[PDB]
Amino acid sequence: MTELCPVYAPFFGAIGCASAIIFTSLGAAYGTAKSGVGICATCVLRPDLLFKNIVPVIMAGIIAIYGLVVSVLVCYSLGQKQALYTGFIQLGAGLSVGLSGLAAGFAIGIVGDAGVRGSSQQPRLFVGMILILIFAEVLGLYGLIVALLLNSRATQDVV
Amino acid sequence: MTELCPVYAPFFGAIGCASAIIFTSLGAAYGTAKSGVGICATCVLRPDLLFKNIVPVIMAGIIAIYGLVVSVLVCYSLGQKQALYTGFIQLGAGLSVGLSGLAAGFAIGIVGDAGVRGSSQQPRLFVGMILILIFAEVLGLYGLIVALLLNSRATQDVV
Amino acid sequence: MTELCPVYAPFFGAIGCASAIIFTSLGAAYGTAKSGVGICATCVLRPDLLFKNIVPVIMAGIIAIYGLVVSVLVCYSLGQKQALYTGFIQLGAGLSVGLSGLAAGFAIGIVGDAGVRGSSQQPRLFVGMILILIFAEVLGLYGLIVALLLNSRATQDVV
Amino acid sequence: MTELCPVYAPFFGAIGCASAIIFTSLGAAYGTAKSGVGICATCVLRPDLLFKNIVPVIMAGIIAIYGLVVSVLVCYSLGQKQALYTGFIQLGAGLSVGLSGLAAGFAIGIVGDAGVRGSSQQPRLFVGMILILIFAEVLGLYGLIVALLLNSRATQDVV
Amino acid sequence: SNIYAPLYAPFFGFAGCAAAMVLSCLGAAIGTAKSGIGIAGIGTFKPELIMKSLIPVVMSGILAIYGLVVAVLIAGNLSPTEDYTLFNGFMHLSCGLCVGFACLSSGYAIGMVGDVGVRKYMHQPRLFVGIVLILIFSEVLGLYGMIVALILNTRGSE
Amino acid sequence: DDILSSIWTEGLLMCLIVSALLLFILIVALSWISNLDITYGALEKSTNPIKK
Amino acid sequence: SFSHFLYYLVLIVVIVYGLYKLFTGHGSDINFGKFLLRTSPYMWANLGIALCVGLSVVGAAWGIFITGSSMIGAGVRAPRITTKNLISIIFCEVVAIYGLIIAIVFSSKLTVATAENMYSKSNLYTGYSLFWAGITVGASNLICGIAVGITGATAAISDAADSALFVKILVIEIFGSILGLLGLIVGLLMAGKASEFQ
Amino acid sequence: MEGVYFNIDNGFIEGVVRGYRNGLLSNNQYINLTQCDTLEDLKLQLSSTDYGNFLSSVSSESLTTSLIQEYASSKLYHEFNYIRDQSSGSTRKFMDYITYGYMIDNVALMITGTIHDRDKGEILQRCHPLGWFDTLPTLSVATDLESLYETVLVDTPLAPYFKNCFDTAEELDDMNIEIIRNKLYKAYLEDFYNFVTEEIPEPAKECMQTLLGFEADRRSINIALNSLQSSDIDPDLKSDLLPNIGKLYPLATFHLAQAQDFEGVRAALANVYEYRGFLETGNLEDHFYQLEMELCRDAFTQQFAISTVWAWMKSKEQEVRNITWIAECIAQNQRERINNYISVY
Ligand SMILES: CCCCCCCC/C=C/CCCCCCCC(=O)OC[C@H](COP(=O)(O)OCCN)OC(=O)CCCCCCC/C=C/CCCCCCCC
User: Where, per the database record, does this protein carry N-acetylmethionine (chain H)?
Assistant: First the structure.
């Protein structure tokens, strides 16, 4: 309708809101299935380690709560008549948290699968996995921080 | 006839309605096909466990309802004359519940095939398969939430 | 510039000049490579046959000479102001000698490696290997007869 | 601004100056490497033939010097105001030496890695491996001769 | 204003400044990664031979110093007030592709040779100089790419 | 007549390269997921009268 | 195959389309110059900030499972290494921090511009720069992360063999880390003279 | 390249297997066993090794050089099945092919027993446990091969490998069975060569082509020398027993099949340097074992390669063979050849 407020402008918000839960869900599924199969293999002979080895399955569930938090904040900045400045902000936020959580998720699966198998054979090797696995859950966070910095600038001084 | 409301605006809405039931049924189907092979291998020897390992087949089906709900709702938003904005909201809703539910079905399929088998050699493992499947079911619930908050904003404050 | 003689016409010629020497050098290289690998094996135990077995390498090398004399005759017919007719032909001259010699190069290497390993077991096979290579070397000559006729027609009765 | 001399004409010359360094280096890197592996394997048994089997690597460095000559020599011919004819001809000069020197590499690498392994066993094969390499090194020299003729014409009778 | 200086020409200058790092670092990465596999592999048999066999990793590092230089010089000739002609941007694009693919080529040869040599050096210690000589031919390939990329820079401006 | 095109407007092109981008990511993520394979040995019951 | 067939069926449509327009006297219709001018410089600037912190996290997460999956296997017999070999997980995480420092610097340059002065010399300059600088930092830290994981999966296996060898392989693991620090520098030099959108 | 995608599936495997090699004994550790006096002193010393308490359940008189070979081997087999369990995909195929060569041996071993009318229990104890399949003891039923094939061996993965074997006689004896056993390895070592070339990627591809080429060359040499015991065998028959993948193929497998005597064999192996001097001097079987270790020692110089599973087994098998040699010499008090042990680590 205007040079600064076209009608295709919300397309980048809606696609950004969607891609934040799509990319973070995929990650938390790769890391739940992969991890989840080690738990179903060690606890045939060592059932006493079951509740202690669900920790990888937790870390990936947090990756999904981040992508839900960004979809909820960019959704309430949408409108039929919004600027094109605002739309690309809404995009980069979803592309940041999504692409970051997808990657973190896959690492949680590969490392968590190996830890549960090893710690059954070496009980001193549990704490070593809990360390390595926090540096993956924090990469989904570093994508969340970028999404939050950008969203602040969304409707600031817009006209 | 109007710049805000073109003739090609329903094109995105109908794809969004189709896409929500399509990508949840692919995930709901992987989950039954994959975890249905495991059940049929274990219960030739021990069919006393037959009405106890249908749970991955239940949960794969609960995904396919998350899409039927969303598809019905956007179908009642469609119209010959509507804003292009309303068409984008509808597409974002269907993809999110869909591609996030496809992700939930891959996880349920793997963990249910590995879990029913391992539970045939260790009954204490059943209780852990149930947890690992709730963290995967919840990945689809999040996509429904994002879908219904988007649809809520689809027809309000639109000209 | 002109309707018959536009500015972009030398492009197809400059690419028709390189295509002759590019695609012959690739074929002449698939020849020396494979035939070289066969030679360097047989002449471990029978060095006396080394000089006889360099014949496939010479045949592959004459291929690349065909793509040189064509590329030279094309250089001296280029111009800032030439017709498309002169520029299209120069492309068809280069693809013909280029992609024919590529084909003679793969035949020679595959035959030259077979008969040279087998001629150390039987000397009578040598005149038969040669007789098979003449057919494969004459393929590149047919592409040279077609190029040379074209180039002699590219500047004939032209505005 | 003239139709003969657009502002986008130096683009075609730049890609020719760059093509000559890109495809010779990848051809010299393939040959140097593989020749370098066949040398190392033999010299464990027989390290008194080390400074005599470094001849395949030298051949492949003469390939990369063929490509520096042309790039240097067309870059002195580049200009803000020049004609398309000068650009189409500089692209041909680079693709010729480039993709014909890439061919020599894939030959010098295959033959060197074989004749070096075979000369450790029979020393009479060292003068067969050098004939064949001469027939490979000659392929990149033909592409240099074509380039030097094209480059001569690029500024000849041009407005 | 000027037809010889459009306003999209900076697009092609930064494209070369990015191609000089992404492709030169990809060469250094391939040299260190593959060589270190060969150095650590023998390390369970001959630890003494490691502290002399870091020559392949320090040559791979020099490759990344070549692209730094070229990228610095390019960024120095970019500004939003200077009239940046389109000719100059096509040169800066080829300043970057040349040194990039040439250093990507050097890193592939240094890694393949450095791996096999170290694994075979433990058996034979008289092979050392020949390895080093072969690694010098693989390094000058990255020098040829920057002797070209410093001329293009000089002629693009003037 | 300084338009880019009537059909291939700049607004459509910006939206088709972004779709191309998000789809490129998706197609990769579904290649990693398909190659998942279950570790069946630690689930089956195997016993031998030779070793045991 | 199928996926490679499409790569060759795209190349064949781009060629037949280019020659349709050229032979007909319409080769000017395929104009990259207008596309660069008419497209919004906010698009280019918000891709770069996303592809910087995104491609940097891909690399970091990559090296963490090469280094992490070998340590855990090596740690069965030598459980003493998981805290000594921990330094390899630290140089792989830190390239993600570099991609987050950029996005702090570049986010400051995101400002609203008037509609008349949107497609100006300076605001186009500033979109082109934050795009290729983000590509630069992201694609370069992607490479430094995969490399340091390979280096640090070996240093886990060597340390389980013998404690002495761990120190000797760190030197390889330090030089690899330089690659990410150089990329950060080059990006800041690009966007040094870029000014916020007016 | 090598390490970019290997660790997704096989990173944990590679780490455990390279920890299993550090427990391989060194030359200094073989000496400490050599100067032992009894088996009760040989037990105390292996406690210092990675064998540990593999004999804690055992008393003084119960010790024998037979019971030590049993519990040192059984510790290799649990480790193998552990690794094969954690595997998936191509790595699970690769580790099933390794076991198809141990059941071929057990097919030939149950059948020869039936010809001599012995009990299955007395035979099963002599069977290797990695070559077990469900219907193995059912081969004690019949002597006709086509009977054994249809009823039992069709379901097996050995079914493709009996094509060239339907020439047996109505009655079945030792020299006929050995010919069957050698046709199987011919087909097994040719299927597991193409499998590696198609699916297994580099640099493990290059290393397993070599390690499988040595297994082929070693058989082609022994099969020829065993024929010298025989009266006469047609040449075209031996061609169906010798595989077609090693350095010997094609030139030397021709001149080996046509070898009437020991000198005619040396005429065939003289044109290959790798195998040039084995026949000339010393015990032949020791020369192969010393060349197997050297190739496996060189496989561990690599990284991100699944060939270390092959290399690891063959190394620890030879470790077990050295323990038993030292053990026999101690009890029998013969100490002339006690230093015969083969070690490269
Ligand atoms: C054959 C049908 C069956 C198969 C259907 C599958 C999907 C096929 C592809 C659908 C998208 C492409 C067709 C629609 C494009 C045309 C729409 C249109 O007219 O929009 C115009 C309008 C511009 O109008 P003006 O600037 O005024 O110019 C005048 C008009 N030319 O631009 C737009 O609205 C552009 C919108 C394009 C959106 C295309 C992409 C849709 C989303 C698909 C995503 C797929 C990838 C998966 C993403 C995963 C992560 C979330």
Answer: 1
- Positive or negative, the Cα torsion across B38, B40, B41, B45? positive
Phi, psi of G25 (to 5 degrees): 75, 45
In H73-104, which positions are buried (b, 16+ CB within 10 angstroms) versus exposed (e)? bebbbebbbebbbbbbebbbebbeeebbbebb
In total, how many domains does chain C have?
Answer: 1
Q: Is the peptide bond before E80 cis (omega within 30 degrees of 0)?
A: no
A and H: number of Cβ contacts within 8 A: 11
D20 touches chain C (CB under 8 A): no
Q: How far apart are CA H109 and CA H131, in angstroms?
A: 11
- Obtained via which technique? cryo-EM
CA distance A135 to A126: 15
Identify the sign of the CA torsion H184, H189, H190, H194: positive
Q: What residue type is assigned to position H116 of the chain? A: H
| Cβ contact, residue pair H301, E40, below 8 Å | no
Ligand 1: which of B5, B8, B90 to mutate, judged by most atoms within 8 Å of the beta carbon?
B8
SS3 E77: coil
Of G27, E85, C7, C75, nearest to D5 (Cα)? C7
G151 CB-near residues (< 8 Å, 6+ apart): E32, E33, E36, G88, G169, G172, G173, G176
What does the alpha-carbon distance between residue H43 and residue H49 come to, in Å, rounded to a whole number? 10
**What does the alpha-carbon distance between residue D61 and residue E137 come to, in Å, rounded to a whole number?**
7
What is the Cα–Cα distance from A157 to E136, expressed in whole angstroms? 59
Closest Cβ–Cβ partner in B91, B138, B149 for A75: B149
Chain G interface test: which of H1, H2, H6, H7 (most G C-beta within 10 Å): H7
CA–CA separation, C59 vs C53, rounded Å? 11
CB contact burial C37-59 (16+ within 10 A = b; e otherwise): bbbbbbbbeeeebbeebbbbbeb
The whole-angstrom separation of Cα H118 and Cα H134 is: 20
Residues of F with Cβ-Cβ distance to H85 under 8 angstroms: 39, 41-42
Pocket of ligand 1 (CB under 6 A): A 8, 11, 15, 18-19, 22; B 8, 15, 95; F 7, 9, 11-12, 15, 19, 22-23, 26
Give the CA distances from residue E155 to residues D75, E91, E151, H24, in Å, rounded to whole numbers and listed in that order: 8, 8, 6, 65
Q: A touches F (3+ CB pairs < 8 Å)? A: yes
Query: Which residue, among G171, G172, G197, would best test binding to E if mutated, counting the most E CBs under 10 Å from its CB?
Result: G172
Separation of G107 CA from ligand 1 center, angstroms? Answer: 29
Spatial separation of the C-alpha atoms in residues F4 and E150, rounded to whole Å: 37
Distance CA C154, CA C147 (A): 10
Give the closest of H87, H88, H129 to F51, CB-based.
H129
Range of the domain at B35: 1-159
Across the interface, whether the CB atoms of D14 and E147 are under 8 A apart is answered: no
Distance B8 CA to ligand 1 centre (A): 10
Q: Which of H310, H314, A110, H15 is nearest to G77 (CA)?
A: H15
- Torsion angle, CA of A87/A88/A89/A90, rounded to 10 degrees? 60
User: What distance in angstroms lies between residue A22's CA and the mean position of ligand 1's atoms?
Assistant: 19
| Collapsed DSSP state (helix, strand, coil) of residue A21 | helix
| Distance from C-alpha of H337 to C-alpha of D132, rounded to nearest angstrom | 54
H68, H324 Cβ separation under 8 angstroms: yes
Computed from CA positions of residues G165, G170, G171, G176, in that sequence, does the dihedral angle turn out positive or negative? positive
CA dist list (Å): H332 to C14, C136, F35, H326, H335: 88, 73, 57, 10, 9
* Resolution of the structure in the document, Å: 2.7
